[PDB]
Symmetry: D2
Subunit: 123 residues, 4 copies
């Protein structure tokens, strides 16, 4: 749900995710990673599927962060695809793809894959 997704979230690495879900299915916010060639905050944009189902199904969503800001440019972007499960203890379970810009010759090693789980902080 938008209200349920809106908030500050942290993942197992200690990275911060601040987001707002709009009525139109949009997601906008900032991301701060605890690891990598990153520093300070980066802008994120994504979408969620606003009308999930009733049932105890998660809401699918995804978002992107290009790792460039006024302090660093890592020439890479990460996308997170996963689901939001609300409740007392709401979580966002995801899998992600991190692509670095390479020459055609090294494209075979441009993408990393992983999974992150986010926990919402009160408020």
């Amino acid at each position: 749900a938008e209200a349920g997704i809106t908030g500050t979230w942290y993942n197992q690495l200690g990275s911060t995710f601040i987001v707002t879900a709009g009525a139109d299915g949009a997601l906008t916010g900032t991301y701060e990673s605890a690891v990598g060639n990153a520093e300070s905050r980066y802008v994120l944009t994504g979408r969620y599927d606003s009308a999930p189902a009733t049932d105890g199904s998660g809401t699918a969503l995804g978002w992107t962060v290009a790792w460039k800001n006024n302090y660093r440019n890592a020439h890479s972007a990460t996308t997170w695809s996963g689901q939001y499960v609300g409740g007392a203890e709401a979580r966002i379970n995801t899998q992600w793809l991190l692509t670095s810009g390479t020459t055609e010759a090294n494209a075979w090693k441009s993408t990393l894959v992983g999974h992150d789980t986010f926990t919402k902080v009160k408020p």
Copy 2:
């Protein structure tokens, strides 16, 4: 580096991707898939890293589509992560993750992964 990302691209499945890249790293547009529980257009939003590096490398980017519009709601979202290469034949080579909303029980099989290559041809 960045540049002719803006345009209409098509992938090997015949899907259509119409995007606009903004000068600060934003990507906006619509997507129409040739396959799946989808029909007509969907909104997409993403980001790309400009200021790519100056050893002829690609420009990294990614975007998302939630499969809900005024015709269908498939309860899923797809994210594409990859890089753009311009030149005579410009290409956007990606790997995607498609997550459908499931119950906890079926969460082990909620995510499909694949790769798509887009051209303006």
Copy 3:
């Protein structure tokens, strides 16, 4: 290490993995899944990289299970790629790809991706 990998392992879904690591870098065993179009045990084969590094690095390894046995044929195969971390509490952290056989038309939806963590049981 071979001895360290050899044993019975279980993952978060409640699936069983029984394996033997040979001196040559080989892995052979049976797998029993708690979920899916599977029943009873299936044969598994894989390899590990026998001479890791010293250090507190994991040992990379991977294995495959084709989901066909005398009771069921699901026409699919799964491969697990990950690392073995030994110690008192040894774990095998992996990511996997599950491919189903399809027509060329539905090949875009043939592969599922996920991650599993295995815990070794004593002995």
Copy 4:
């Protein structure tokens, strides 16, 4: 269904895959990669699901290579998961995971993912 899997295949990077499929679902052979911290041949072992279904579908299979041999040890392993399609032009379309051994600290970036397509040409 199963059948001409046995043979020498090559992928878009020019790597060579020489395999033997056994009648009960086993795959054995050697692999030589054209890229990476690798040289000469490596042992591979896998499985395929025969008895594929009778709606012209592919045969699922997968295999593993640990990148250690008498020349180099790169402390990594790769697994390829995909399906074989025979016919005039036989193909093995896969998606792979390459995991390198890291310390817990670097475990978030231990795994690369990609796709390879093999032909006997």
